[PDB]
Structure formats: C-alpha cells, structure tokens
C-alpha cells in the first residue's frame, strides 16, 4: 500500500546541518488532510516527535527544536524534507518519517512509517581499532576493540570455530567521538592452559583487521 | 509540555500470559491516542488508533480502551512476536506526544550475574590511557547496577556500559562496563573494584585487582 522511506547522510559532523528526505509512494500530498511527520529515536531510548507537515502546508514543529527545524514538501517528487541545523552528538539517533491519515475520524495515529535511517554525529575521520586483551571452573576472557570509526567492526573467535559462550556487546560512542566495544567468551577453566583463544577483529570501513589472541 | 507517562514500564511475561499496560496523560486528549509495538531491529507498528480502534491487519488479541486521561492496551494472549517495546501517542495537542515506552521481556527464573573484572593491558597502558572493564554475565532480570571504585573513591562519569539483548535460548542478559582512566591516574591508585547490585544477590558482590601485585 503506502510505503515511505528515509534518505540522507548516515554520518554527520557537530555544528553542520542534517538534511533528511522522506520518499513515500502509495499516496500523494495532494490527498486532503494527509500528513507526513518526522519521529526520531536516540540509541536505546524512546521515540521523540519532531515535526509534521500536511497536504495544505501547515507545519507544526517541536517547541524545543523549533528554531533548528525546517520542514518542506515538494509535491512533484513526493518527498518531504526536514532540515535540522547545528546538530550535536545528542542528535545521534534513528530518524523516521510517517504517514498520517485524513478524515474519510481515524486520522488519529501515524499508521505507516518509513523503515528508519540512523544518523550519528561525530566530527571524526575513519579510524581503525586497537585491540586489547581482556583476560583472566568458569572463566572469562575477551577483547576490547577500542577507538574505531565509524561502525561497524565484526568479531569472531578462533576464526568461527567457537561460537558459544561468546558475547559481542553493542559498541558505545565515547566522548571522543570514537567507538569502543568488547567481545567476551565464557569457557570453563581447564581448557585455559590447553585451549587457545583468539578474537578475529575486522573493521571494514578502514581496512583494519586484527587477529588478537588472549591469555592470563 | 503535554506529559503523558505510560505505567508498567518493563513487563516480564511468558507466552500465553495476559498483560495490561497503561498510558496516563496530564491533560485530557479526547480519544486521540495511538498504540504501537516495536520489535528490535525496526520501525513502530500501529495496533490501536483512536484509543479503542483495532488497526486493520492487527491480531484480534490486541485491544484498547480509555478516554481523556487514562488509556490501556491489553494482550489477551501473549505471543512470541509480542516481546518488544510498546508506545502510546496522543495526537490531540501539538506537539504530538509519545510515552516513555513499556517493554515486555521473556520471563525466566531469577539468575544472579557472574562477575569478572579485567585490568588494563600493559600494551594499552602506553598510549596513555587505562581501560578497566567489568563483565556481568548471564543474569535475570535485566536490571543490574555497577559501581566502580578506585581506592574506594566512588567513580562517577567515566565509565560506560552496554547490555546485550535477551538470549534467545537461556533468556539471560549480560552487561559490560568500562572504566576509563588516564594512564597516570591508573598508576597512582591501588584497588580497582567493580561492585554489582542485582536481584540475584543478597548483598552486592565486588571484584577487585590491586594494580601491581
């Protein structure tokens, strides 16, 4: 039926301007009432209403983001544009655009949503990771893949031959604008002096791949 | 400004259970309230529109009720595909408002986390910084608290953590915290301890290494 979609730059620098674009198709902005709004969701937090623009052009913004947001519609393309200026690390989130109804009573809810395009703020250039050991019956060892950008890096253990006990936590975006994630695997002692443990790290965005073994 | 703070904010239920989650509004919003179910990985999905109307294509097990300030969204029978986060949104006042979110995870027996502390690595220690990490492995429920201490001074604002998503098999969670000191600071303190508070432990458990012994 109706399907919208999000476009724009996945990577944006503190200060500049984020121009996102919602391309829908299943309706037009000429249909009466029809609205298309922007909802954004920080990493792991809740949805936040941004702005809405209707068929006949009114537009309501978020009182808190009012002087930073600008919403427009080009009816020849069926795109809606939202410009958010002077962004900062706090604007890092997933941005959604959604289609709202029109009176036929049920113009009461955002019934269809784009799929989402996650934007991340960081005045930072591509950069490979440094892999440090996290090492020592249940026992834990792991690898700390530090300061890389942007996502993503991939981590396996023993070239894949060991997939249980593992854990490859969600990276965190540090204050430095760089990423840092840990990958731990839980084995049972004994093997500790007979078995060998190496994490294979691959950060495709910078061509840096790292096999880094781990022990006491 | 239109607060609306959704009650029960992290259910813990099994398949076949019947749960009722609420969404309170600071000002009356007629029946202009909508309910969504989001399931990690993707966008919000409409279940209820206009507070009580089942959105076409949505399972009959979802239902909604309420008007003005109180609204509820009941799941007659809990399905596997129902374990996610739910949101309510009112569209009666601008700005349109979303609640904080209520999340229902798979229920399992309380499991206390296995705590491990990893000192910085000698190699990292000469690049000028020290990252000590704490691992809380496989626990339930999700709520866990980690406090770092260096020579007993509670550390605040220099650690970061991330939690995995519920294991599809044993249904436990695992957490990771990173204390990041500047090398010099690391080398002038002794006891680095990681103290974990969780429903599965009577009194908090600590893990420490004394830097150079």
């Amino acid at each position: 039926r109706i399907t919208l979609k999000e476009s724009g730059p996945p990577l944006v620098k503190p200060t500049q301007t984020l121009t996102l674009t919602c391309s829908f198709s299943g309706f037009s902005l000429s249909d009466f009432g029809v609205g298309v709004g922007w909802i954004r969701q920080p990493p792991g937090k809740a949805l936040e209403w941004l702005a809405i623009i209707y068929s006949d052009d009114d537009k309501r913004y978020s009182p808190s983001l009012n002087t930073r947001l600008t919403i427009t519609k080009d009816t020849s393309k069926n795109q809606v544009v939202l410009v958010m200026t002077r962004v900062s690390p706090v604007d890092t989130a997933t941005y959604f655009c959604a289609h709202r109804r029109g009176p036929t009573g049920p113009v009461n809810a955002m019934d269809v949503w784009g799929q989402g395009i996650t934007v991340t703020i960081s005045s930072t250039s591509t950069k490979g990771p440094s892999v440090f050991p996290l090492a020592p019956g249940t026992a834990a060892l792991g690898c700390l893949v530090k300061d890389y950008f942007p996502e993503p890096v991939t981590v396996s253990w023993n070239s894949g031959a060991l997939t249980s006990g593992v854990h490859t936590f969600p990276a965190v975006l540090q204050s430095s604008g760089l990423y840092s994630l840990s990958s731990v695997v839980t084995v049972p002692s004994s093997s500790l002096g007979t078995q060998t443990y190496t994490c294979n790290v691959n950060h495709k965005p910078s061509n840096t791949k790292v096999d880094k073994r781990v022990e006491p | 400004a239109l607060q609306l703070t959704q009650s029960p904010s992290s259910l813990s239920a099994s398949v076949g259970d019947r749960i009722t989650i609420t969404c309170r509004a600071s000002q009356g919003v007629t029946s202009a309230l909508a309910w969504y179910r989001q399931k990690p990985g993707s966008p919000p999905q409409l279940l209820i529109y206009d507070a009580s109307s089942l959105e076409s294509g949505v399972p009959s097990r979802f239902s909604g009720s309420g008007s003005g300030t109180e609204f509820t969204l009941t799941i007659s029978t809990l399905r596997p595909e129902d374990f996610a986060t739910y949101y309510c949104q009112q569209l009666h006042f601008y700005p349109h408002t979303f609640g904080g979110g209520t999340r229902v995870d798979v229920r399992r027996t309380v499991a206390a986390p296995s705590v491990f502390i990893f000192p910085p690595s000698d190699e990292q220690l000469k690049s000028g910084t020290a990252s000590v990490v704490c691992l809380l492995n496989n626990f339930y429920p999700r709520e866990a608290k980690v406090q770092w201490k260096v020579d007993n001074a509670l550390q605040s604002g220099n650690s970061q953590e991330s939690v995995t998503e519920q294991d599809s098999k044993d249904s436990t969670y695992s957490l990771s915290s990173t204390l990041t000191l500047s090398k010099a600071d690391y080398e002038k303190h002794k006891v680095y301890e990681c103290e974990v508070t969780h429903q599965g432990l009577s009194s908090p458990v600590t893990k420490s290494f004394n830097r150079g012994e």
Binding site: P103, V107 | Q27, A32, L91, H92
Partner: peptide, 7 residues
C-alpha cells in the same frame, strides 16, 4: 496549550 486539527 494548543489543539490539533481534528480535536
């Protein structure tokens, strides 16, 4: 505050 169209 402020109402929405359909209120």
């Amino acid at each position: 505050l402020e109402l929405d169209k359909w209120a």
